[PDB]
Design a protein around this ligand. Structure first.
Ligand SMILES: O=C(O)C[C@@H](NC(=O)c1cc(-c2ccc(-c3ccncc3)cc2)cs1)c1ccccc1
Ligand SMILES: O=C(O)C[C@@H](NC(=O)c1cc(-c2ccc(-c3ccncc3)cc2)cs1)c1ccccc1
Ligand SMILES: O=C(O)C[C@@H](NC(=O)c1cc(-c2ccc(-c3ccncc3)cc2)cs1)c1ccccc1
Ligand SMILES: O=C(O)C[C@@H](NC(=O)c1cc(-c2ccc(-c3ccncc3)cc2)cs1)c1ccccc1
Ligand SMILES: O=C(O)C[C@@H](NC(=O)c1cc(-c2ccc(-c3ccncc3)cc2)cs1)c1ccccc1
Ligand SMILES: O=C(O)C[C@@H](NC(=O)c1cc(-c2ccc(-c3ccncc3)cc2)cs1)c1ccccc1
Ligand SMILES: O=C(O)C[C@@H](NC(=O)c1cc(-c2ccc(-c3ccncc3)cc2)cs1)c1ccccc1
Ligand SMILES: O=C(O)C[C@@H](NC(=O)c1cc(-c2ccc(-c3ccncc3)cc2)cs1)c1ccccc1
Ligand SMILES: O=C(O)C[C@@H](NC(=O)c1cc(-c2ccc(-c3ccncc3)cc2)cs1)c1ccccc1
Ligand SMILES: [Ca+2]
Ligand SMILES: [Ca+2]
Ligand SMILES: [Ca+2]
Ligand SMILES: [Ca+2]
Ligand SMILES: [Ca+2]
Ligand SMILES: [Ca+2]
Ligand SMILES: [Ca+2]
Ligand SMILES: [Ca+2]
Ligand SMILES: [Ca+2]
Ligand SMILES: [Ca+2]
Ligand SMILES: [Ca+2]
Ligand SMILES: [Ca+2]
Ligand SMILES: [Zn+2]
Ligand SMILES: [Zn+2]
Ligand SMILES: [Zn+2]
Ligand SMILES: [Zn+2]
Ligand SMILES: [Zn+2]
Ligand SMILES: [Zn+2]
Ligand SMILES: [Zn+2]
Ligand SMILES: [Zn+2]
Ligand SMILES: [Zn+2]
Ligand SMILES: [Zn+2]
Ligand SMILES: [Zn+2]
Ligand SMILES: [Zn+2]
Lengths: 159, 159, 159, 159, 159, 159
């Protein structure tokens, strides 16, 4: 489907990457969702058990969805759009080195991008958008959504 | 799908309306389901956590399913038929004043109607059916399903 | 889903009611779609053979979708929202007397409403909207969608 | 889904086995559908081009649906239940020798069984039912569904 | 769908048959899943609450999926392929007498067969395969998957 | 789903870009499918009317699937993976200048990539693969899939 037909969406962290502290991961992911709930009527809640709408997973190589990871570098992550099962799920390539900042690959920034896909956003052709296909680091304190990003997400969920 | 392909169906009360006591809501909803399980092989169970087949929700205005509520009066509630995700979900317009009896809008009676939709029943053209499109109050102690209602639900689930 | 994920939609008149001339049925249905395409980016095309997104059917009593018609009066027609299979399909009760005027049930006016459902619109609580649940004849020459009708349909397909 | 949500169903013979004359294949398949339409409100129509609800195909070995045929003998055919895509589709193993008599494998008798699956019927444990899992030839002139066959099919489509 | 698009699959025992000790049932089922995870990248986890991918159920007669059981003998069990809802679910006919060994019907062996279906395997025509349609008892200590079984499951999930 | 569950797939060119001759568009699209059928058990057929598995469309700006094109440059095209409805559909941005050579954007080369998506292939991180995300012109006479392209496509359809 093009969008989640509800405002209360849940997510769950399937497993944790040993690259970061469990709570730094929770923080990065939660702040990532917060980026999108700030400009839409959507609200996100983390759950530890049961099925959630969006399952955040860390994995390497082939992990069952037929879109295997490629080791360090190259593809860093991917996610599926709204739907049942794997729909909305965001997978992070464990072969990358996830960090809270500019060392290795920043989890927060990458998560903001993937959640974009999870909510129904495709790639943007605007270099300022978080949905632009190329990864780059910017400080979390000064990071913000481009206008193209706001338009896209609001086109889908309004507010 | 036209029907739930199982006899054990679960439901969960997403949130409670502040118009009634939490337990009066539980009672109204549970008795509503009981009305249908009495004439079919179906059985309903309430769960507090995890995804349930039927999510009972209280909400106002636009709540994400693209069928926004209209404030007090007019549409009182709605529900989707059997299926994944929002399928089977029953939404109650919080702008209405829900009551245990004839004050405002009776939750039990409305719930019986919506659960009818949740189980796959459309609107009936018979004025005596609970599936008739027009809301009316009747005492819970003397309320009963019309023959048209029994035929419809049994046509779907038998017994 | 909540909407057809395309602007070019096809429909097919499965069979014709013997109440009107084939040419009149086609005209009425064509005009009904036109009402909605005039306020959205949508474009409609009629096909004579093969699968269409929207199948217009005339039937009576139980016709397979578990929402049996009730003979003369009452249920005049019904339609399923966007989706595969019967999704988007519009069924007209052949037990009604379809006409091009104010006598019997007006095909054109009923079609505009049904197509509203086929496009993803639910019932409106505004008495002036074509999506209001109650059928009524109105000058078929000065007929126009109500604001609520325009808002809702453009909320889905924009323009 | 458990059943086709309509009474008018279409089928298409994708390709013909070189074992029989085109006319004989058509006759056998037509007679097979007739068996079921005679005991239900269902009506079947063959189309020569385009998508049908039920696609009849002759294939051998691995043919794309992950349920590869086994060459001569063993699996004679299989079909998917009601649904979109390959749902309802019936596949006949071209490695079998299809005939109009008791030699080789009888097309007509195998078709009645396969169509049972296409309509939503699973295997029966009654030795006298066409849905019993074991293929056997029987006088194709006095052939008739068993009671279990009638009950099950009318349990889905009634009449 | 043809396969579960993930390597971590969960299952849950809906209810227990009174024929065996609760833990003997857990053991039989768990060992059954182990048989398949041994030759694939798949991994299975039991959960007590929430929805699981594969729901193991004990039931008699008609239980809602339109594939009613037939009492003692005949059909012993069945399961649906990968998918949402009932997809992947394995149902065991309670009218059979389930045992840890050769008395009555062996639960472990039957479970290995049904889970095969749950993972997307159809019936095999090879008499040595666990996916062969006919039930037979062999000691759990010397039971092993046929080559045909290994090929099928690995064709779907690799490794 | 991850893949088309059949070896015979149909496609239809919904409309033609005015940039090239109808004959050239057909040739380019035909050659694009040929690239993939040459390395898999798949067979492709073009149909002029009716529903195809893969619908090739030329469009500009917002065209209904919520993934609007961006005018000249940037997004050249996109396609949906295997599935019903728009599943498998390939959209080409009419704002691009489609050609049979190295000027403008080469239709054939872009089609091979898009069809990769339509068949279930995601983007590759190998610079030599047609599925790499970056469009580039290459001698359309010595063009050949990269090993990564062959592995991935045969991983889904084999051969
Ligand atoms: O490293 C790369 O950029 C290429 C690689 N990319 C990825 O896998 C991915 C790149 C991103 C991504 C993350 C953050 C931002 C972003 C935007 C704006 N402000 C801050 C952050 C943009 C994209 C997610 S996966 C890739 C290679 C090959 C094929 C597909 C993708
Ligand atoms: O108030 C109304 O009746 C109109 C309004 N209705 C609703 O929203 C609704 C009305 C009902 C309903 C509730 C109970 C009963 C019933 C039947 C038999 N015995 C006891 C109770 C019937 C319908 C649910 S939502 C409405 C307005 C505009 C468009 C659609 C619906
Ligand atoms: O006399 C009878 O037996 C019943 C007759 N049915 C009817 O007249 C019916 C009247 C209605 C009805 C529909 C909508 C609303 C409504 C009003 C305001 N806001 C929202 C919704 C009220 C009534 C449904 S059937 C009938 C007869 C024969 C066959 C079918 C129906
Ligand atoms: O209205 C009835 O007679 C009851 C019956 N209704 C229907 O089947 C239907 C009523 C309509 C309908 C058609 C046109 C208009 C309309 C609005 C504004 N201007 C012009 C035309 C409104 C509704 C379509 S089906 C019904 C019965 C039971 C449950 C729901 C609806
Ligand atoms: O000799 C061989 O290798 C095996 C041969 N396969 C067979 O004969 C086969 C026999 C059966 C079989 C099917 C159903 C039942 C049955 C009986 C009673 N109640 C329910 C179900 C028993 C057996 C399947 S394949 C075969 C050979 C070549 C190709 C395919 C199959
Ligand atoms: O029967 C076989 O040779 C085994 C094979 N079976 C099949 O493929 C099939 C057997 C049948 C079948 C056809 C007709 C009748 C029938 C019933 C009553 N009166 C007349 C006709 C029963 C079954 C269709 S496919 C098979 C192999 C492996 C797994 C399941 C089934
Ligand atoms: O009792 C029978 O075999 C027929 C009956 N079968 C079933 O319901 C079923 C039979 C089985 C089955 C269980 C274990 C094994 C097996 C294979 C290899 N090694 C050890 C164990 C094979 C099949 C599951 S349900 C049946 C009757 C009628 C219609 C369909 C099926
Ligand atoms: O100048 C502009 O405004 C932006 C222009 N857009 C672009 O040039 C764009 C460049 C890219 C891009 C795509 C993939 C990769 C990449 C590289 C390596 N590994 C993986 C992925 C890098 C960039 C997307 S749009 C544009 C203009 C007008 C309309 C659309 C796009
Ligand atoms: O490449 C661009 O100009 C950016 C844009 N890309 C596209 O739309 C697209 C790029 C391609 C593509 C076509 C052919 C080849 C290829 C590979 C090897 N040998 C020959 C040909 C690679 C990619 C299809 S759409 C884009 C923008 C924003 C987000 C994703 C992609
Ligand atoms: Ca990587
Ligand atoms: Ca790592
Ligand atoms: Ca209201
Ligand atoms: Ca209230
Ligand atoms: Ca009527
Ligand atoms: Ca009539
Ligand atoms: Ca065979
Ligand atoms: Ca043959
Ligand atoms: Ca039994
Ligand atoms: Ca028992
Ligand atoms: Ca463009
Ligand atoms: Ca152009
Ligand atoms: Zn993944
Ligand atoms: Zn991305
Ligand atoms: Zn709602
Ligand atoms: Zn209602
Ligand atoms: Zn209908
Ligand atoms: Zn209506
Ligand atoms: Zn097949
Ligand atoms: Zn069969
Ligand atoms: Zn069952
Ligand atoms: Zn089996
Ligand atoms: Zn598009
Ligand atoms: Zn691409």
């Amino acid at each position: 489907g093009p969008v989640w037909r509800k405002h209360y969406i849940t997510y769950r962290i399937n497993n944790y990457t040993p690259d970061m502290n469990r709570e730094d991961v929770d923080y990065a992911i939660r702040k990532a969702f917060q980026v999108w709930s700030n400009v839409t009527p959507l609200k996100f809640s983390k759950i530890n058990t049961g099925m959630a709408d969006i399952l955040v997973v860390f994995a390497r190589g082939a992990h069952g969805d037929f879109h295997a990871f490629d080791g360090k570098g190259g593809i860093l992550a991917h996610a599926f759009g709204p739907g049942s099962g794997i729909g909305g799920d965001a997978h992070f390539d464990e072969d990358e080195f996830w960090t809270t900042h500019s060392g290795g690959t920043n989890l927060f920034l990458t998560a903001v991008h993937e959640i974009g896909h999870s909510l129904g956003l495709g790639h943007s052709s605007d270099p300022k958008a978080v949905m632009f296909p190329t990864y780059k680091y910017v400080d979390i304190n000064t990071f913000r959504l481009s206008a193209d990003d706001i338009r896209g997400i609001q086109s889908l969920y309004g507010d």
